[PDB]
């Protein structure tokens, strides 16, 4: 992977979980299950 891990860590640390980070293909159903997961978290 090409994003330096320190930058990756900086971005991920500072991004709300509910915000999308990119638009990689995945079915509607998989995204909804992911969203269910994001809501369940503490």
């Amino acid at each position: 992977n090409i994003l330096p891990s320190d930058i990756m860590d900086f971005v991920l640390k500072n991004t709300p979980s509910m915000q999308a980070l990119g638009e990689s293909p995945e079915s509607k159903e998989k995204r909804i299950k992911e969203l269910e997961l994001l809501l369940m978290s503490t």
Partner: protein, 85 residues
């Protein structure tokens, strides 16, 4: 149908409304956070959450209904933006 409510705290519902707001509008700048329109957004979120809370039959279905709503709102935002390109 409504027994699961006993386990759901107001503290939980509040965290969920918060996640619902972030899902609609992830990282507002200070000006946006201060805008009256941000209140409109928050009220809409609380409205959706309350709707799902009062129509789900289990905690699992409650999360699922919220997720479906989020999917649908985000899809609406993405489409509107693409339509202007």
């Amino acid at each position: 149908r409504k027994g699961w409510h006993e386990h759901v705290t107001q503290d939980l519902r509040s965290h969920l409304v918060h996640k619902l707001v972030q899902a609609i509008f992830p990282t507002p700048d200070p000006a946006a956070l201060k805008d009256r329109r941000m209140e409109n957004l928050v009220a809409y979120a609380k409205k959706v959450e309350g709707d799902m809370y009062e129509s789900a039959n289990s905690r699992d279905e409650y999360y699922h209904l919220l997720a479906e709503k989020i999917y649908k709102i985000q899809k609406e935002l993405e489409e509107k933006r693409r339509s202007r390109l």
